[PDB]
Amino acid sequence: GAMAQNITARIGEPLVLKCKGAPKKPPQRLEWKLNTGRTEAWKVLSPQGGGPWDSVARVLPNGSLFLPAVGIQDEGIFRCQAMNRNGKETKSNYRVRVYQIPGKPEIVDSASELTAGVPNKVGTCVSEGSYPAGTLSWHLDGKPLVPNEKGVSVKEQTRRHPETGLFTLQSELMVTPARGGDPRPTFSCSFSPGLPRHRALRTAPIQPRVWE
Amino acid sequence: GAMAQNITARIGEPLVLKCKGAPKKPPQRLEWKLNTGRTEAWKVLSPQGGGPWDSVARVLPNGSLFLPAVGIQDEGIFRCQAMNRNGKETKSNYRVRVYQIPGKPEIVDSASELTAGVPNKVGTCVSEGSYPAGTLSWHLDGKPLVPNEKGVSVKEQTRRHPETGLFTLQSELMVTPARGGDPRPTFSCSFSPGLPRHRALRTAPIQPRVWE
Amino acid sequence: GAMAQNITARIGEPLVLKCKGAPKKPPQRLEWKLNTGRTEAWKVLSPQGGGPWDSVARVLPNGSLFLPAVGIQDEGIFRCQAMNRNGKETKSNYRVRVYQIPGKPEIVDSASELTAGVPNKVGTCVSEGSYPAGTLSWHLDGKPLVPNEKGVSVKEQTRRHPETGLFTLQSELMVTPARGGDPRPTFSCSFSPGLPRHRALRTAPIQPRVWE
Amino acid sequence: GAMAQNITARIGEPLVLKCKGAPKKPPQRLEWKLNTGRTEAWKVLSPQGGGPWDSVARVLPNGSLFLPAVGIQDEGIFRCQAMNRNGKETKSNYRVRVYQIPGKPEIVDSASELTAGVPNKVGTCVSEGSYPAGTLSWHLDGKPLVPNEKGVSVKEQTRRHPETGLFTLQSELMVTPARGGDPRPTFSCSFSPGLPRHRALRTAPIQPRVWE
Numbered sequence: 001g002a003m004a005q006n007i008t009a010r011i012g013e014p015l016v017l018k019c020k021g022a023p024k025k026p027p028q029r030l031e032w033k034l035n036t037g038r039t040e041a042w043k044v045l046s047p048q049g050g051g052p053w054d055s056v057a058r059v060l061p062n063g064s065l066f067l068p069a070v071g072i073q074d075e076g077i078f079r080c081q082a083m084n085r086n087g088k089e090t091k092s093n094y095r096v097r098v099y100q101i102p103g104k105p106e107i108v109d110s111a112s113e114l115t116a117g118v119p120n121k122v123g124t125c126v127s128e129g130s131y132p133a134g135t136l137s138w139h140l141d142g143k144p145l146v147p148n149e150k151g152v153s154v155k156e157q158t159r160r161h162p163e164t165g166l167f168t169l170q171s172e173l174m175v176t177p178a179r180g181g182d183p184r185p186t187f188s189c190s191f192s193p194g195l196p197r198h199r200a201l202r203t204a205p206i207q208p209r210v211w212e
Numbered sequence: 213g214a215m216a217q218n219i220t221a222r223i224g225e226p227l228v229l230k231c232k233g234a235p236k237k238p239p240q241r242l243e244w245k246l247n248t249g250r251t252e253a254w255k256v257l258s259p260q261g262g263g264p265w266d267s268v269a270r271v272l273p274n275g276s277l278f279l280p281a282v283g284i285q286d287e288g289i290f291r292c293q294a295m296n297r298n299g300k301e302t303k304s305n306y307r308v309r310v311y312q313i314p315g316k317p318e319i320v321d322s323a324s325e326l327t328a329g330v331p332n333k334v335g336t337c338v339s340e341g342s343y344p345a346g347t348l349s350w351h352l353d354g355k356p357l358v359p360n361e362k363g364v365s366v367k368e369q370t371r372r373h374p375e376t377g378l379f380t381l382q383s384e385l386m387v388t389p390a391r392g393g394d395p396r397p398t399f400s401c402s403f404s405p406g407l408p409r410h411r412a413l414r415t416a417p418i419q420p421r422v423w424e
Numbered sequence: 425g426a427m428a429q430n431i432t433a434r435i436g437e438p439l440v441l442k443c444k445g446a447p448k449k450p451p452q453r454l455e456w457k458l459n460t461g462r463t464e465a466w467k468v469l470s471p472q473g474g475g476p477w478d479s480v481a482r483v484l485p486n487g488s489l490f491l492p493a494v495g496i497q498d499e500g501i502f503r504c505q506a507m508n509r510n511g512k513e514t515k516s517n518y519r520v521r522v523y524q525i526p527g528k529p530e531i532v533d534s535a536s537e538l539t540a541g542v543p544n545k546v547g548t549c550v551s552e553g554s555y556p557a558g559t560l561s562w563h564l565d566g567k568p569l570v571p572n573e574k575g576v577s578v579k580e581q582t583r584r585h586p587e588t589g590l591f592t593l594q595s596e597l598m599v600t601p602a603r604g605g606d607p608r609p610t611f612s613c614s615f616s617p618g619l620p621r622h623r624a625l626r627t628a629p630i631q632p633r634v635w636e
Numbered sequence: 637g638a639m640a641q642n643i644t645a646r647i648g649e650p651l652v653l654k655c656k657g658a659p660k661k662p663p664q665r666l667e668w669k670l671n672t673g674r675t676e677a678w679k680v681l682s683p684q685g686g687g688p689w690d691s692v693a694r695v696l697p698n699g700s701l702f703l704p705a706v707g708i709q710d711e712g713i714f715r716c717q718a719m720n721r722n723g724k725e726t727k728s729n730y731r732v733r734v735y736q737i738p739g740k741p742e743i744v745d746s747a748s749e750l751t752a753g754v755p756n757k758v759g760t761c762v763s764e765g766s767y768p769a770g771t772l773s774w775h776l777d778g779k780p781l782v783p784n785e786k787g788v789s790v791k792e793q794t795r796r797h798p799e800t801g802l803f804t805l806q807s808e809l810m811v812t813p814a815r816g817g818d819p820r821p822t823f824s825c826s827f828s829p830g831l832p833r834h835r836a837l838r839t840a841p842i843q844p845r846v847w848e
């Protein structure tokens with residue numbers, strides 16, 4: 001598409017998008033155009049409003065577009081075109097991406113003892129309620145664990161809530177400990193969001209006992 | 213995919229899918245698997261049920277799956293696997309497609325007079341509330357009108373309701389009537405649903421006057 | 425979206441779209457904008473052309489857009505905006521839908537004899553190479569058969585060619601003949617395209633013998 | 637879905653997926669099922685093979701599935717089910733995600749001089765050829781720059797190649813430098829891939845002059 005301001009909008013929270021160049025109050029020659037999961041191609045919204053879209057997005061007195069509670073289907077492109085008093089046209093172009101932050105990740109079914117030289121199920125990490133899905137990763141003594149290397153293997157599962165569409169992730173870690181290692185290793189799991197500059201979330205550690 | 217029974221389910225109505233070969237009442241060794249717009253890949257549902265899916269679909273005493281009110285996101289594949297008292301396993305495979313019937317189509321902005329040898333806007337046909345979209349067509353004295361032939365031209369528009377996802381269609385007919393024709397032609401518009409074996413819906417006719 | 429001329433384009437065939445209002449030859453102030461399965465949102469194409477898109481769509485001397493061989497990914501919206509010599513702006517808006525016609529449908533594995541009062545597999549109808557999928561239906565003595573009524577049942581299967589994306593459909597008919605019926609019924613199968621005003625295709629008939 | 641091994645497969649490279657529990661060589665009771673961008677729901681592949689799928693994926697002598705050159709449409713789920721000599725059944729479940737690494741990112745149109753207290757276009761960063769899209773980010777003297785804070789603003793653009801589907805990203809940085817700052821700041825841009833554990837790519841720095 002074209003150059004846009006990129007906007008990240010949390011599901012369930014309001015969103016206000018500015019119509020650049022609009023007069024501060026009516027009268028206003030402005031039009032919003034949106035192409036989102038709610039539209040077939042472009043929908044035009046005007047300051048007069050009306051109809052079903054008044055339940056979703058309305059133009060404010062200052063020309064900004066207001067959504068009271070963003071949902072997954074609002075992801076897309078939002079554009080404004082305004083004329084000011086002198087007649088200069090100004091365009092605004094926004095790319096809206098939506099997200100939700102899951103609960104703190106948790107480790108369930110952790111092993112209290114591990115045996116060297118055979119595979120052991122260390123635990124299952126679980127994260128509930130994210131959008132977009134994001135990813136789970138395992139760490140040993142603070143350091144990321146790379147699957148399929150050093151006797152490490154991981155299996156993963158994704159499901160979605162049938163009404164909200166939010167993701168639940170599960171990640172099961174198996175390790176084949178090498179003889180001679182630290183008998184009290186510290187494992188942990190982290191959730192990394194799909195969108196950039198969002199913080200990772202991490203579990204409490206587990207410290208199983210390894211028997212040589 | 214595999215061979216399945218096709219099921220056509222009206223939006224907002226209940227749906228009961230039978231689990232072939234299940235015992236008539238509990239105890240029952242059976243399992244449903246669904247891959248629909250509500251799932252990431254397959255979801256398994258069992259007679260014990262539980263969790264968020266209990267708000268969407270539950271297994272009945274006789275083993276059938278029940279949805280109290282189908283939505284667009286329930287389109288997809290539904291399978292049951294059951295063992296009877298003797299141990300014969302029986303599979304059921306359903307492909308569920310959902311639909312909604314729009315209101316009666318209407319013609320708006322119809323012309324009361326037409327002029328031979330020039331293009332005239334005959335009218336705009338509108339249909340509100342269909343799923344899947346379906347199509348609009350124009351008829352002259354009962355016979356379908358073919359666009360881009362005999363001075364006929366049509367333009368079309370599709371919108372979706374921002375909350376229900378249902379389609380509204382609009383179709384604008386222009387005709388350049390030829391000199392020497394019927395001075396009182398009868399036009400009408402019909403809505404043809406997307407799904408097979410469903411009846412078309414037709415507008416009342418309009419009978420403009422053609423001036424030579 | 426907005427009002428558009430609806431265009432149906434056969435896969436593998438060229439497509440020429442007119443830029444209304446363009447001068448007949450260069451110089452030309454015109455721009456094409458496309459949003460199709462090949463684009464992220466809108467792509468702009470100009471008479472100078474250039475780059476990868478020259479392998480897909482180019483602007484002709486008269487301003488029309490030319491695709492030498494349409495594919496599934498070309499389905500979408502194509503718009504032109506032109507200024508003429510006087511400076512009048514003219515917009516063209518096209519909604520392009522693509523299709524392919526399958527081979528003649530065929531019945532395989534047909535029954536030569538049927539037995540009254542029990543279920544019989546009449547045959548399997550097969551259609552290869554359609555886009556969009558379209559549907560298969562069974563007819564008895566010219567009259568459509570309605571599944572789940574009068575001892576009729578149908579199962580269906582859809583697959584896609586892994587490289588071309590075209591659909592193959594299969595439809596298996598079972599009938600439980602009622603005692604006292606015509607001992608030499610005539611069955612046939614028809615393919616109905618997904619797009620409007622396209623002709624149905626039908627199989628040769630089969631005439632099994634019914635034993636009372 | 638179910639628990640699976642995640643597989644990350646580079647576009648254009650071969651992929652071999654193991655069928656756990658298969659005999660080392662024929663005879664072999666095993667079957668692969670795939671649901672990818674090439675299939676309508678599940679496709680079954682067998683050691684005998686045949687048809688169009690032989691051009692895409694084949695079962696090897698040892699039972700593994702081989703794709704000679706992965707594409708975007710091979711993203712999806714791949715499962716094998718095998719019985720050994722004794723009759724133990726073993727399942728393998730793989731979730732295949734595909735990727736491509738773009739060329740080194742580059743800054744174009746960089747500013748050689750900046751003026752304090754007004755907005756300046758620092759440069760445009762460009763990355764060509766990624767899958768999935770990934771993201772571009774700006775850094776000042778090694779630290780990430782956060783948009784809409786401290787006189788920083790960014791606009792972004794995404795295009796796809798019309799034949800390969802690979803992404804090109806562009807990111808334009810504007811800064812209003814504050815009076816009193818470093819007169820020789822160092823800016824750079826980095827590409828962060830969509831998939832986890834893949835390395836970022838970074839541009840050479842630019843060091844404009846700031847005029848107080």
Ligand SMILES: Cc1c(C(=O)O)[nH]c2ccc(Br)cc12
Nearest residue numbers: 029030031081082083089090
């Ligand atoms: C000039 C104008 C009117 C009007 O005054 O008729 N409405 C508008 C909506 C968007 C953009 Br740009 C310009 C206008």
Ligand SMILES: Cc1c(C(=O)O)[nH]c2ccc(Br)cc12
Nearest residue numbers: 047049057058059060061066
């Ligand atoms: C108070 C109000 C006015 C007005 O003062 O005219 N217009 C609006 C448009 C959208 C939303 Br939400 C609130 C208002």
Ligand SMILES: Cc1c(C(=O)O)[nH]c2ccc(Br)cc12
Nearest residue numbers: 002003079080081091092093
């Ligand atoms: C082409 C375009 C851009 C851009 O290139 O940034 N922004 C816009 C905002 C509103 C409308 Br209406 C059109 C555009």
Ligand SMILES: Cc1c(C(=O)O)[nH]c2ccc(Br)cc12
Nearest residue numbers: 072162163164165249250251
């Ligand atoms: C997109 C979406 C919503 C929503 O838009 O609210 N709800 C869902 C429930 C299950 C799956 Br799968 C996807 C969704």
Ligand SMILES: Cc1c(C(=O)O)[nH]c2ccc(Br)cc12
Nearest residue numbers: 241242243293294295301302
């Ligand atoms: C044997 C069996 C159990 C059980 O072990 O009780 N549960 C089941 C669910 C579906 C199908 Br088919 C078979 C079974």
Ligand SMILES: Cc1c(C(=O)O)[nH]c2ccc(Br)cc12
Nearest residue numbers: 259261269270271272273278
């Ligand atoms: C009444 C009832 C029983 C029961 O009697 O055990 N089980 C159920 C499962 C689904 C729905 Br809906 C209703 C019932």
Ligand SMILES: Cc1c(C(=O)O)[nH]c2ccc(Br)cc12
Nearest residue numbers: 037038039284374375376377
């Ligand atoms: C699929 C769908 C639903 C639903 O599933 O309720 N609602 C919608 C509103 C607008 C657009 Br576009 C699509 C949908």
Ligand SMILES: Cc1c(C(=O)O)[nH]c2ccc(Br)cc12
Nearest residue numbers: 453454455505506507513514
């Ligand atoms: C005026 C004009 C130029 C130009 O002469 O600079 N190029 C164009 C492309 C599309 C449309 Br409408 C108008 C123009």
Ligand SMILES: Cc1c(C(=O)O)[nH]c2ccc(Br)cc12
Nearest residue numbers: 471473481482483484485490
């Ligand atoms: C011959 C030719 C000219 C020219 O004569 O300048 N321009 C073109 C643009 C597209 C395609 Br396809 C063919 C031509």
Ligand SMILES: Cc1c(C(=O)O)[nH]c2ccc(Br)cc12
Nearest residue numbers: 426427503504505515516517
């Ligand atoms: C808004 C619009 C329509 C319509 O409403 O029919 N057609 C177009 C053709 C080209 C460009 Br650029 C914009 C439009």
Ligand SMILES: Cc1c(C(=O)O)[nH]c2ccc(Br)cc12
Nearest residue numbers: 496586587588589673674675
């Ligand atoms: C859309 C499509 C193409 C194409 O665009 O050529 N090829 C395919 C092969 C299998 C499946 Br499923 C879909 C496609």
Ligand SMILES: Cc1c(C(=O)O)[nH]c2ccc(Br)cc12
Nearest residue numbers: 665666667717718719725726
């Ligand atoms: C028993 C068996 C046959 C056969 O009957 O020879 N083919 C198979 C393919 C996959 C899996 Br698990 C088991 C079998």
Ligand SMILES: Cc1c(C(=O)O)[nH]c2ccc(Br)cc12
Nearest residue numbers: 683685693694695696697702
């Ligand atoms: C050489 C060969 C055999 C065989 O030796 O039987 N089977 C195969 C299946 C797939 C691909 Br690729 C190569 C082979």
Ligand SMILES: Cc1c(C(=O)O)[nH]c2ccc(Br)cc12
Nearest residue numbers: 461462463708798799800801
């Ligand atoms: C998925 C894809 C392919 C491919 O699978 O080769 N090619 C493309 C060209 C443009 C756009 Br948009 C998407 C694709």
Ligand SMILES: [Cl-]
Nearest residue numbers: 039040371372
């Ligand atoms: Cl819409």
Ligand SMILES: [Cl-]
Nearest residue numbers: 159160251252
């Ligand atoms: Cl799910």
